[PDB]
Design a protein around this ligand. Structure first.
Ligand SMILES: [Cl-]
Ligand SMILES: [Cl-]
Ligand SMILES: [Cl-]
Lengths: 32, 32
């Protein structure tokens, strides 16, 4: 899948799918 | 990025990047 680790909401064409943890920071997981 | 929601360990070229929550189930987020 194509996915992004986001600092804001997911884009409209993306689905919230979990959490990224990179270098200690949390991100929304947004896939399409 | 290219990401998969895994029930096992990440493949050699993937990095463990977080967790997926899909239909009430936990998975390892594996990204390359
Ligand atoms: Cl973002
Ligand atoms: Cl898997
Ligand atoms: Cl879920």
């Amino acid at each position: 899948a194509t996915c992004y680790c986001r600092t804001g909401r997911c884009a409209t064409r993306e689905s919230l799918s979990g959490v990224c943890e990179i270098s200690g920071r949390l991100y929304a997981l947004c896939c399409r």
